[PDB]
Structure formats: structure tokens, C-alpha cells
Write an enzyme that holds these catalytic residues in place. Structure first.
Site, PDB file in Angstrom:
ATOM      1  N   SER A  71       0.845  -1.201   0.000  1.00  0.00           N
ATOM      2  CA  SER A  71       0.000   0.000   0.000  1.00  0.00           C
ATOM      3  C   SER A  71       0.877   1.246   0.000  1.00  0.00           C
ATOM      4  CB  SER A  71      -0.989  -0.109   1.163  1.00  0.00           C
ATOM      5  OG  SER A  71      -1.840   1.024   1.215  1.00  0.00           O
TER       6      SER A  71
ATOM      7  N   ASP B 265      10.597   5.186  -9.853  1.00  0.00           N
ATOM      8  CA  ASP B 265      10.268   5.637 -11.202  1.00  0.00           C
ATOM      9  C   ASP B 265      10.889   6.992 -11.517  1.00  0.00           C
ATOM     10  OD1 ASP B 265       8.851   3.315 -11.135  1.00  0.00           O
ATOM     11  OD2 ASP B 265       6.906   4.200 -11.626  1.00  0.00           O
TER      12      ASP B 265
ATOM     13  N   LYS C 259      -0.494  -4.426  -2.869  1.00  0.00           N
ATOM     14  CA  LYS C 259      -1.812  -3.905  -2.515  1.00  0.00           C
ATOM     15  C   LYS C 259      -1.878  -2.473  -3.032  1.00  0.00           C
ATOM     16  CE  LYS C 259      -3.128  -2.840   1.699  1.00  0.00           C
ATOM     17  NZ  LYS C 259      -3.603  -2.843   3.111  1.00  0.00           N
TER      18      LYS C 259
END
Lengths: 380, 360, 50
Positions: free
Chosen positions: A255, A266, A280
Site C-alpha cells: 500500500s 520511477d 496492494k
């Protein structure tokens, strides 16, 4: 326009063993449809819609287990560091089989948490299954207040780097991190440990990322509807924009822990170290449907700045390193010039014993050592 | 009409705000599968595959390959080829690792996938590659022995195994009892038997009970209240019976065990059963799909219910090997089954007690 | 044999299901247990014979 539901309701109404009202059938159909639609779905009748901030309690205590479903069964995502379940010996990936005496064979993750919640002074029994164990394990754990310092910062001995442990995104993380970085201005790198961190509040995932990322989208929320899709962009108010960061994640990271890890990855802002995360990455929402009734269904899922999804895949680390102890503390009576014939003579912290029990931690420090060498080469 | 409004509103919100697209045909099947699974522990919607699987369990036939297969030694392995089947006729052997079925590798696939690749219509070609040896065989209708009876070595008693209540149970038992006319007692093994057809549970119990109610059903008030009484034509009214049951015995297996127990016609041996005290009926909806509904509750001849309780056997034992120190059931088989040994010993006691009665 | 070695499944824990000689002495004497089990069978046979 599907008549085969009416055909099923008609036969149930007259062939079932007990007489049930059409109202009972409609609730069981709504409750049944949601149970086969999503694993995070729930049906909220008139009472549980009105009472959505306590399980009819004024005590609020729990075990500290984050519950999810993989392999079609209830699995422990991660026990929180320092919680009763963590101290009792519950381990990540454990499949929960019974709660007290109630089987979880066809139980939803929202039902299971409500059984685990309770008075912060009372026992509860859970029976779990673990991969290499012969029999299911039975844990008798007593509930307690889960609040505990989610973040601590420790300097790593004989290095300029500092160890930042985030146990969970528990409302306090962004401030506690920033204060620890303010308390150590002379540092040159962070080991951001999000192992066993099952996530938490999105405000802390976006907040913690804003300390390190100056520009760009941090995470996006996107569903079926092309409107109402939201993307959380970073503020220009990022301090520590240049500082080396090495992030540790494992199968217990989920999460918010994957949002911060994926965002830093990224943006090429940090190096992700460890093993592939839980995955999740969805947001559920409550929708009022009937007269004071509501349904809880997943309305969108989280997408990384690269457009990659978090849900079924999770974060793949840049450096995969499964846990273990560092190999040797030497192992040779080897020969050198120093012991050679007629040789020309010569003209709170994280201790090395802690690092030598964790190649994952050593890999993070060694990844910062390479960070610091490149920053000397490119600064000339 | 404006009923089902509360359900249609939820379907609309799912159509409008759910994360993925999904169709109404997908929504409604999920709701139909959901509603049936949420009424009872045993009511369900049978898809085209699962309605044929149910019919295979009733007929005792499934047209497959002719192997019992599992994931033993971590790979698909032939447990045993069945006698008279294509795999037995071709020379496939136990322990062989199934490497490819047709041309598809079996490694990453589940046994549920291998069943679907191996099973099919009879007289259909299938090739399997095992370790590599390659077998080309035509599929055929496989008969599953619902009941088999074999004599117990060096004793006058007979071992009767009923694996499941198929359409052949009562006849296969009756013909097996006729084939052994000089047997002094039967061990009726219903362990791990998940149940089956109610008509065969009543039939098998009526084979042994001459008088009384066998089972009663109630689903609406107490007017239909169907009751199954013995037809009085039971041939084997006196023969000793020892019934083996365990936690896998359910439904039809508990009706037979419960009827024999309440009439004190047999001794129940083993451990407390599954405790299924309901009667399911399936009514076909589509041409190839059916709906399975819990339709009534069944009560034992004493009127006691078994629901959620199970049968408490007369003699509890639990599995294990028998202590020892200094086509027939051999003593090496009995020595591995303390439950089978306990069942035989109760027949020995019964045979002695009735000889005390044949005296003067 | 052991009192059990199973956390097995029953209908009592399924979804939506409709709803001076002590045992310590007998469990160590399989010979004594076998003797009691023979009386349990005897008393059933002599009750069938009503």
C-alpha cells in the site's frame, strides 16, 4: 434485463428448506454479488452504515495484523513492528485459518479485521498456517493499544549514513522523518527501511515522497471513469532533493509503502533494495445505494508515475537480495607482504554486528557507498 | 416489476462506479452464484462443467483416461491404472511421471487442468508423454466401483466397502452379499464417504432393517413431512454389521449409519462424522446447467437431528497401527488399520454373544 | 491411538450452516480399551434382542 435471476429467486422462494422473505433474498444476492465481485467489497445495511466508526465499542484495541487475500485465502500481509501479534510470533505470509473458533474459509478481509478488533485488555485466539510447519499454529494474543513510534532514526557507525526505519504510515511519519533529518544535518545518505511495512495513510506516502522529489507526479488514481481520475503531483517544497537514498522493501511492504517506493524508483530518485513487494494498490469507496444503505467497492487503483500498476504486480526492486547473514568474517591464514621475508616496511547507533546479520542492510549501505563515489567523480 | 429494486440499484452503482468494466451477464452470474452460496452451506449454482461432474458422480462413469492421478513427488504421477481401462491396456504404470498430455507440458499446470485435458468423450484420441515413453490411447467410459466386497483372511467375516452413494450401491451390496452366502458378519466401511443419492441410503438401510422408519424429512410446516419406512422385505435382518465412519462420512453415509444405530442393528465404530443433516435437490435450469438447493432437514429414526453434531460412534478409536511384539483383506492390511481391527473384533464379540443364546 | 491429529473441516464450522478408572488409565491400556469396547458391543447386541 436478465430474467435468470428471477428464475433463481422464484425457485428459491418455494423450494428452499426454510421460508425467507424476498427482502432476505435481495440482501443475500447483494451481499453475495459483492462477495464474488471484489475481495475488498462489503455490504453495509442500515445499522453498519450509520455505525461506521466503531464496532459497537468505545475501547479500540487490536492485534496489529494487516490482513489481505492471496492464493484465494486470508494471508497476513505483515505484523506491525512492536505490536502484540509481532511479539507473539506471527510472521508475514501466514494464512489465517481460524479466529477464536470461527473458520475463515469463506470470510472477507473486512470481516476478519472486525473479529481481531476488541477491548485493549482481552485475549483472542487465532489459528494460522505456515509453509514449512507440519500443523497449524495456535496463537493466544492479548489486545493492546497499537500506538508506538512508527519512525526512528539511527546513525550507522563509522559511516556518514543514517538508518531511517518506518514501521508503518501511522499519521506521524512525514514529521518524524523530517525531524530526524533536521537532527542530523551532517549526513550524506539514508537507508529508508520499509520492510514489513504494510502501508497506511496515503497522506504520509505523498508527504514522505515530497521531502525527496522536487517535480512530477508522485502517484495516480485511475478507474473506469476517465473523469474523477486523480494524480498527486509533488510540491516544489522538496528539501533533501540531492541526498542519496537506498530503500529496503520486502514481501511485507504494501500500500503506502509501495507508493513511496515506486515513486522514488520511477523518478530515479532512489535505489530499491530487497525483494518483490506484496502488491496492494487499490482504493475502496463507500457508495450510498438505497434508503440509508451503502455498498463498499473498489472504485480505482493506484498507478505509478511510469504508468505501472501496483495491484497484482507490486514493486520489483533494482537489487534483489534475499535475507541472510553476511558470508565470512575472513576465513584465511592467507599470505601477505606484511608477513613476508625481508619485506619493505611501511613508509543509539547501528553497529557492524547488526549489519553482519542482514545482507539486505549491508546491500543498502554498499549502495550508498557507490552513490557517494559517483557524487565525488561528477563533482570533480 | 418494482420488486428487486434494492438489488438492481446495487447493480447500477457497480455498473457506474466499479473500477473495471464488467458486463451485466458477468454481474448477474456472480450474483446468482453469490446468492445460492449465501443461502446455505451446500446450495450452489452448477455451471455447465459442474453439472456434468455431478452427473458423473451419480452414474459412476466419467469417460476419462483410466488413471488415478495426483501431484505426488511434486509432479503429476500415475498413482494406479484402473483394471480394464485404456491406460492399463496400453501399459501405463504406477509412478510414471506425466510429462506432457497431448503436446502441452504438465509442469506449471494444476491437477484441475490435467483432469480437463485427460477427460473427454469416449472413443476420442488422446496422447500422453511420460517418463520418454509416448502412449496413444482412445478414451473410454470408466466404471468407478461404487461398492466392492472382499473376504477377510482367516475369518468368517466379509469386508464391504462403499466409497460413495452411486446408482449402483444397493444392488452391488446385495449381489456381493449373495456371492458370499456363508459369511458370519460384514464390516460396512463408510469412511471418507461424502454421501450421495438419498434413494440409495434408504435402499441400503432397508436391505438390513425389517421394520420401522428409516429417515424423515421436514421442509414446510409438518404436512408433507415425508417419512421412509422399511418395506419389510429385508433379507439380512440378523447378520452382524460393524460400520466404520469418520470425519469424511457425510449425508447419505450418516443416514445409513444413523438408521442402523437407532435400530441398534449395527455397531458404529470410528470417530464422529461430518454432520451434514440436510437434503439437497438440484433442479435443472438451462439445458446444461442446474441449481442446487437445500430442500429439507432429515431426522434419524429416533427423531434426533444430526445437523452440525454428527454421529457419535458407539466405539471411538481414531486411526493408527496396531501394537504387536514378542483379493482378500490380509492380516498385513488389518495391522495397518486399528479401526478395521476394532470393527472385526466387535464382530467376534457379537458372534460369541449369539452363540451364548444358541445353547441349553 | 492419539486423541486426534486433525484440524479437520466439519459442517459445524462452514459458511451459513444450518444449526475410579479414568480416561487417563484406559488410554494407556489398549488392552483395557479393547475389553470395554467388547462390552459396548455386547450390550448393543443384547439390546437388539428385545
Amino acid at each position: 434485463m436478465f430474467s435468470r435471476f428471477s428464475n433463481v429467486v422464484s425457485e428459491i422462494e418455494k423450494k428452499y428448506v426454510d421460508k425467507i422473505s424476498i427482502s432476505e433474498i435481495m440482501t443475500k444476492a447483494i451481499e453475495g454479488l459483492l462477495s464474488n465481485l471484489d475481495a475488498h467489497s462489503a455490504y453495509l445495511n442500515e445499522k453498519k452504515f450509520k455505525e461506521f466508526q466503531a464496532q459497537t465499542e468505545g475501547e479500540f484495541g487490536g492485534l496489529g495484523i494487516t490482513v489481505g487475500m492471496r492464493d484465494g485465502v486470508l494471508t497476513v500481509i505483515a505484523p506491525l513492528e512492536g505490536t502484540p501479534a509481532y511479539k507473539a510470533g506471527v510472521k508475514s505470509g501466514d494464512n489465517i485459518l481460524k479466529i477464536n473458533n470461527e473458520s475463515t474459509l469463506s470470510m472477507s478481509i473486512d470481516d476478519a479485521i472486525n473479529l481481531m478488533r476488541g477491548k485493549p485488555k482481552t485475549p483472542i485466539q487465532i489459528t494460522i498456517v505456515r509453509k514449512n510447519e507440519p500443523k497449524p499454529l495456535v496463537f493466544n494474543i492479548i489486545r493492546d493499544i497499537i500506538k508506538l513510534p512508527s519512525v526512528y532514526v539511527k546513525k550507522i557507525k563509522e559511516t556518514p549514513y543514517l538508518y531511517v526505519r518506518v514501521s508503518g504510515f501511522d499519521k506521524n511519519v512525514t514529521k518524524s522523518v523530517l525531524e530526524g533529518l533536521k537532527a542530523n544535518p551532517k549526513a550524506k545518505g539514508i537507508v529508508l527501511d520499509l520492510r514489513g511495512n504494510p502501508g497506511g495513510l496515503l497522506n504520509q506516502a505523498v508527504g514522505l515522497s515530497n521531502l525527496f522529489i522536487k517535480e512530477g507526479v508522485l502517484v495516480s488514481q485511475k478507474g473506469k471513469n476517465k473523469e474523477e481520475s486523480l494524480e498527486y503531483k509533488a510540491n516544489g517544497r522538496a528539501p533533501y532533493t540531492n541526498l542519496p537514498i537506498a530503500v529496503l522493501v520486502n514481501g511485507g511492504s504494501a500500500s503506502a509503502s509501495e507508493i513511496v517506493a515506486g515513486a522514488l524508483q520511477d523518478h530515479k530518485r532512489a535505489v530499491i533494495i530487497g525483494e518483490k513487494t506484496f502488491g496492494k494498490g487499490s482504493v475502496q469507496m463507500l457508495l450510498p445505494v438505497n434508503k440509508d444503505e451503502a455498498i463498499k467497492i473498489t472504485t480505482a487503483r493506484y498507478y505509478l508515475p511510469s504508468g505501472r500498476t501496483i495491484q497484482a504486480k507490486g514493486i520489483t526492486p533494482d537489487i534483489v537480495i534475499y535475507p541472510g547473514k553476511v558470508p565470512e568474517n575472513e576465513n584465511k591464514f592467507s599470505l601477505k607482504e606484511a608477513d613476508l621475508k625481508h619485506h619493505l616496511e611501511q613508509e543509539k547507533e547501528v553497529t557492524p554486528k547488526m549489519i553482519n546479520d542482514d545482507i539486505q542492510l549491508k546491500t543498502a549501505i554498499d549502495s550508498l557507498k557507490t552513490w557517494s563515489i559517483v557524487d565525488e567523480k561528477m563533482d570533480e
